[PDB]
Amino acid sequence: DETEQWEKFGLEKRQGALELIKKGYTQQLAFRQPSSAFAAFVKRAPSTWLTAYVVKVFSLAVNLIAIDSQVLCGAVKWLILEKQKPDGVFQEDAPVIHQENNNEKDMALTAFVLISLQEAKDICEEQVNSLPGSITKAGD
Amino acid sequence: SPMYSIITPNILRLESEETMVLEAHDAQGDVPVTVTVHDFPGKKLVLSSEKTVLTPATNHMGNVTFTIPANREFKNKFVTVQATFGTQVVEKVVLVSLQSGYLFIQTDKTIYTPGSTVLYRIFTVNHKLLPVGRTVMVNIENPEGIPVKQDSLSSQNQLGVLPLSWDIPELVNMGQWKIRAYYENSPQQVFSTEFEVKEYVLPSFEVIVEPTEKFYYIYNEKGLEVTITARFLYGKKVEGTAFVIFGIQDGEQRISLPESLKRIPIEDGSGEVVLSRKVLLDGVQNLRAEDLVGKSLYVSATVILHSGSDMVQAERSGIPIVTSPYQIHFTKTPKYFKPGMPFDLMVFVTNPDGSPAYRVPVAVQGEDTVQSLTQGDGVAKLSINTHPSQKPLSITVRTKKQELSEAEQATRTMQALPYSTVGNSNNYLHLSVLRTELRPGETLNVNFLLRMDRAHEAKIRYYTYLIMNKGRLLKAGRQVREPGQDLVVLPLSITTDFIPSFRLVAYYTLIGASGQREVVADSVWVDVKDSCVGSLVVKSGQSEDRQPVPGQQMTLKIEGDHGARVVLVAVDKGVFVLNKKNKLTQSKIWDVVEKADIGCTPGSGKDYAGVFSDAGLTFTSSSGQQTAQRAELQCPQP
Numbered sequence: 165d166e167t168e169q170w171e172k173f174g175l176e177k178r179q180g181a182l183e184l185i186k187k188g189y190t191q192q193l194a195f196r197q198p199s200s201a202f203a204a205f206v207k208r209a210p211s212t213w214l215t216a217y218v219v220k221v222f223s224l225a226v227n228l229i230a231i232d233s234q235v236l237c238g239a240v241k242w243l244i245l246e247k248q249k250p251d252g253v254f255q256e257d258a259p260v261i262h263q264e265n266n267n268e269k270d271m272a273l274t275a276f277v278l279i280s281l282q283e284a285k286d287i288c289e290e291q292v293n294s295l296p297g298s299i300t301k302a303g304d
Numbered sequence: 305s306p307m308y309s310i311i312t313p314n315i316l317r318l319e320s321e322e323t324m325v326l327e328a329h330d331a332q333g334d335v336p337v338t339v340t341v342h343d344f345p346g347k348k349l350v351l352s353s354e355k356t357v358l359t360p361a362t363n364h365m366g367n368v369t370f371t372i373p374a375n376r377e378f379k380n381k382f383v384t385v386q387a388t389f390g391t392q393v394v395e396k397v398v399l400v401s402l403q404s405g406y407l408f409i410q411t412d413k414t415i416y417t418p419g420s421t422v423l424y425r426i427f428t429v430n431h432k433l434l435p436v437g438r439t440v441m442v443n444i445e446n447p448e449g450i451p452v453k454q455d456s457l458s459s460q461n462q463l464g465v466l467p468l469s470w471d472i473p474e475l476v477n478m479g480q481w482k483i484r485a486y487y488e489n490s491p492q493q494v495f496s497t498e499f500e501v502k503e504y505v506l507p508s509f510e511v512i513v514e515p516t517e518k519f520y521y522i523y524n525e526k527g528l529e530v531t532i533t534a535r536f537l538y539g540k541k542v543e544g545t546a547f548v549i550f551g552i553q554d555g556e557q558r559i560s561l562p563e564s565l566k567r568i569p570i571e572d573g574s575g576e577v578v579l580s581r582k583v584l585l586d587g588v589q590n591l592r593a594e595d596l597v598g599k600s601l602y603v604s605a606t607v608i609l610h611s612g613s614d615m616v617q618a619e620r621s622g623i624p625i626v627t628s629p630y631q632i633h634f635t636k637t638p639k640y641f642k643p644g645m646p647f648d649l650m651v652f653v654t655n656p657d658g659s660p661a662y663r664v665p666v667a668v669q670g671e672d673t674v675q676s677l678t679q680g681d682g683v684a685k686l687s688i689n690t691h692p693s694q695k696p697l698s699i700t701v702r703t704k705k706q707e708l709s710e711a712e713q714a715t716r717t718m719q720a721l722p723y724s725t726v727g728n729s730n731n732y733l734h735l736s737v738l739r740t741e742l743r744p745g746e747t748l749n750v751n752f753l754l755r756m757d758r759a760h761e762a763k764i765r766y767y768t769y770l771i772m773n774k775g776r777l778l779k780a781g782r783q784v785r786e787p788g789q790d791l792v793v794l795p796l797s798i799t800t801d802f803i804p805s806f807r808l809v810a811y812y813t814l815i816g817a818s819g820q821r822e823v824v825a826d827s828v829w830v831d832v833k834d835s836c837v838g839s840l841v842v843k844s845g846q847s848e849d850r851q852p853v854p855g856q857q858m859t860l861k862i863e864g865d866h867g868a869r870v871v872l873v874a875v876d877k878g879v880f881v882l883n884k885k886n887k888l889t890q891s892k893i894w895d896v897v898e899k900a901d902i903g904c905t906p907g908s909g910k911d912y913a914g915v916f917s918d919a920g921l922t923f924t925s926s927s928g929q930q931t932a933q934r935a936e937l938q939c940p941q942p
């Protein structure tokens with residue numbers, strides 16, 4: 165889209181891609197816990213890293229498909245409230261999925277979650293209020 | 305003095321034809337007629353204005369049809385209807401509201417698996433059950449309520465049928481999914497159908513365990529008998545051995561019975577096992593038999609094939625232990641009875657689990673001669689003649705199944721109040737109809753019966769009858785009566801326009817003994833068989849001389865109304881049987897239509913105005929006779 169190659173590649177394929185994204189989104193909701201958090205496996209402890217990644221991917225697809233705003237806003241609110249320490253560090257309680265004084269471990273997780281939140285900055289800004297404060301604390 | 309009358313439905317609908325009935329009583333010559341409708345608050349504008357002339361040839365009977373445009377000029381929206389009857393004028397303010405239509409969603413199966421395709425159709429209809437081209441939104445929701453698929457369709461030029469398909473991924477939320485459909489214009493009305501996703505399960509063969517009865521009676525010496533049935537997935541029966549064990553269940557704790565374990569041979573594919581009452585009583589070491597009431601039983605069966613070692617298990621939990629299994633109710637009885645004339649009841653007997661009973665005798669208490677047998681739908685119809693006084697009538701119905709004792713039979717009591725004479729004049733009208741189900745093409749004889757003093761009988765020369773169907777006014781007319789006759793029979797034809805139950809309201813007017821006016825009215829609710837206006841039959845075109853073989857060609861024949869669109873789907877019949885909770889049937893469609901009737905009281909009211917208002921009618925005359933205004937869009941709860 166931002167390069168505008170559809171006129172020669174074929175605009176007829178865009179709907180197909182949209183359908184693919186829709187199917188992928190339909191599958192991903194299988195991992196959503198009732199507490200608005202995404203777990204690595206079905207019916208298991210929710211993971212902060214996976215929740216942040218899912219929020220980052222969802223925030224990129226609202227302009228394409230009809231992503232539910234309730235799900236994404238609930239995930240962002242869960243990340244900001246239940247997983248963020250006052251110092252500006254996002255806690256992790258589920259078993260780790262990626263490669264993690266506890267230095268160089270919380271830094272990578274905080275950086276990843278910050279990259280995820282910067283995608284949903286202007287999307288859940290109305291439903292979630294304290295998002296800019298969390299972003300500022302994490303950046304500091 | 306001439307009396308001019310106006311009759312119209314209680315609620316008028318926009319963009320739909322509405323019939324207005326105009327009358328002149330004791331008026332000579334002919335009278336011109338102009339009816340107009342204005343806004344209620346200020347009569348600012350004319351929504352419609354029609355004219356007609358009432359001739360003495362037709363006994364001053366006229367019907368003017370008008371359509372209220374969807375101007376939406378103003379805002380419970382009311383319109384005032386003013387009719388000029390020559391010089392005289394009669395005005396009545398009637399409520400107005402609009403209805404959108406109905407959506408019916410058809411799914412081939414109710415239980416799917418991850419990977420299978422969901423096929424569903426949306427049928428668009430109006431209040432008359434006719435295809436209409438609108439725009440409808442369809443959504444699919446998971447158990448959490450998150451719309452996973454959204455579609456915007458238009459049924460225009462599609463003849464009211466919308467096909468849709470959804471591809472279930474391999475990894476989806478497991479639970480009860482739903483489909484929501486609603487017209488774009490009126491998103492306040494959403495029609496929902498639900499299915500299940502479940503997980504892949506496939507046993508070696510199917511086994512069904514169920515008792516003969518739907519409960520257990522404590523004082524039943526025969527015990528509890530259970531019929532175990534087994535059959536393969538390809539149709540042939542099973543011959544083997546089944547191990548069955550029963551067990552009580554005190555709420556959530558299963559005190560399994562060890563002495564009740566039995567081994568039975570399954571031959572021909574069906575078995576049978578009986579639990580003796582003595583075993584059950586000794587299992588709980590309780591001397592009181594009544595203490596087991598409310599402690600449901602359960603049956604566990606294990607069928608083992610005779611050839612190999614295939615084993616499958618079946619269960620049937622929740623067989624209640626009850627001493628008063630049947631509970632009795634009234635369904636469609638009127639509440640006001642004309643004293644001294646027969647009164648028709650209707651009774652509904654239900655099992656402990658809420659299902660309708662079958663062949664349970666009912667009988668009123670004290671008469672003993674008004675017995676009946678409960679039908680397939682649980683309805684038993686009785687009639688009781690009423691006393692000649694005006695004290696309220698108390699009627700009690702009891703089930704008379706032989707197995708139970710008198711103290712354990714169901715009983716329901718109802719009280720009815722007399723129809724209120726206008727001036728204690730003891731003038732009544734009575735309509736007697738057959739209390740069964742009719743069919744289109746049959747002819748119905750309605751017996752108009754009249755009682756009054758033998759001094760003003762000659763002053764009544766006619767009866768006026770109106771037929772209400774689907775809320776609208778179906779037809780009206782006259783019943784000329786020769787003086788001196790008490791009973792007059794109206795032969796009424798029944799057509800496909802009467803397919804849902806219609807209502808008949810009749811009345812006569814005369815000058816009072818003192819000198820005032822008098823209006824006496826009665827009404828009845830008549831139910832006819834629910835079937836489509838047309839027909840649709842699917843049969844085998846080829847000669848019926850062979851059982852169908854896999855992979856071979858078969859020829860089908862569909863017979864239906866010319867130019868219709870027919871849609872087909874084939875199901876396994878293993879999922880059709882378990883779909884008893886909700887199926888797309890003509891009876892269900894007509895019930896859905898019947899849930900939106902203007903009037904709700906079955907057949908009578910306290911006054912003449914009550915009779916006219918209950919049936920969904922209004923009646924205003926040049927004199928001081930009129931029915932109370934209705935403002936609510938739904939009558940009070942039953």
Ligand SMILES: *[C@@H]1O[C@H](CO)[C@@H](O)[C@H](O)[C@H]1NC(C)=O
Nearest residue numbers: 323366367777778779780781
């Ligand atoms: C209305 O009048 C027309 C005149 O043709 C008649 O066909 C129709 O049956 C009448 N309807 C009623 C309700 O009287």
